[PDB]
Amino acid sequence: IVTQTMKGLDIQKVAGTWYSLAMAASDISLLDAQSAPLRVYVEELKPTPEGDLEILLQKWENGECAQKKIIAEKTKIPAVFKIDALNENKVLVLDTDYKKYLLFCMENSAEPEQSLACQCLVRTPEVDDEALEKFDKALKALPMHIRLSFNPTQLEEQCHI
Ligand SMILES: C=C1CC[C@H](O)C/C1=C\C=C1/CCC[C@]2(C)[C@@H]([C@H](C)CCCC(C)C)CC[C@@H]12
Ligand SMILES: C=C1CC[C@H](O)C/C1=C\C=C1\CCC[C@]2(C)[C@@H]([C@H](C)CCCC(C)C)CC[C@@H]12
Fold first, then answer.
1. DSSP code for 5
2. Of the chain's two ends, which shows fewer C-beta atoms within 10 Å, N or C?
3. Cα–Cα distance for residue pair 130/60, rounded to 1 Å
């Protein structure tokens, strides 16, 4: 569904700390409540020397913020990864300048119209306007119905408060 992957991606260079400044999905219910299925908060990106990609994130399960460790496997496409879930879920890196921001989407390899969720990640607990500008543009051609944004204070708390 998304055809804006980034060219020449050097995955190793996205390593470390990241903040989920904004997020969006194709369905309200995906980012609805705090426990919504795709309501995840990224903590750090850990690319293996082997080329795969470890994801450290926070998810609000139960009555608390749970720390999750997910592994997204590399594919023949340097910007696309596959996380081993009950189904085949692809992770796509649309663009990144390595130092300030990174845009990625999570797509379900199903139909009629699979679920889609994208995020605007930034390196610092600051509201980066340009990154959000780019995030908006990239979203223009996508079927989103819910879009969320967080403030600096929320970014420093777990599960964004
Ligand atoms: C796990 C939980 C726990 C939290 C939810 O309530 C239910 C759930 C399952 C369903 C999907 C299955 C596995 C892959 C998904 C799609 C997670 C995905 C690994 C995050 C994409 C990572 C990207 C952060 C870089 C987000 C929701 C997960
Ligand atoms: C209400 C919501 C909820 C939040 C999501 O952005 C999607 C939405 C509605 C539908 C249109 C769909 C795709 C492209 C649009 C037009 C978004 C686009 C990312 C903003 C870039 C500006 C637009 C001028 C072309 C803004 C509204 C989006």
1. P
2. C
3. 29
CA 121 – CA 42 distance, rounded (Å): 8
- Domains of the chain in start order, with CATH, are 1-161 (2.40.128.20)
Method: X-ray
Minimum CA distance residue for ligand 2 atom 23: 140
Tally the C-alpha atoms within 13 A of residue 8's C-alpha that lie toward its C-beta: 3
Computed on alpha carbons and rounded to an integer, the radius of gyration of the chain in Å comes to 14
104 in Cβ contact with 21 (< 8 Å)? no
Q: In degrees rounded to 5, what are phi and psi of residue 141?
A: -85, 10
Instruction: Give the tokens for residue 50.
Output: 């082997």
First to last CA, the chain: 32
- Helix (H) / strand (E) element for 107: namely strand 101-108
Q: Strand runs (DSSP E) across 16-79, as ranges?
A: 16-17, 19-25, 40-47, 53-61, 64-74
Resolution in A: 2.4
> Contact 143/56 with Cβ under 8 angstroms?
no
Ligand 2 geometric centre to CA of 138 (Å)? 10
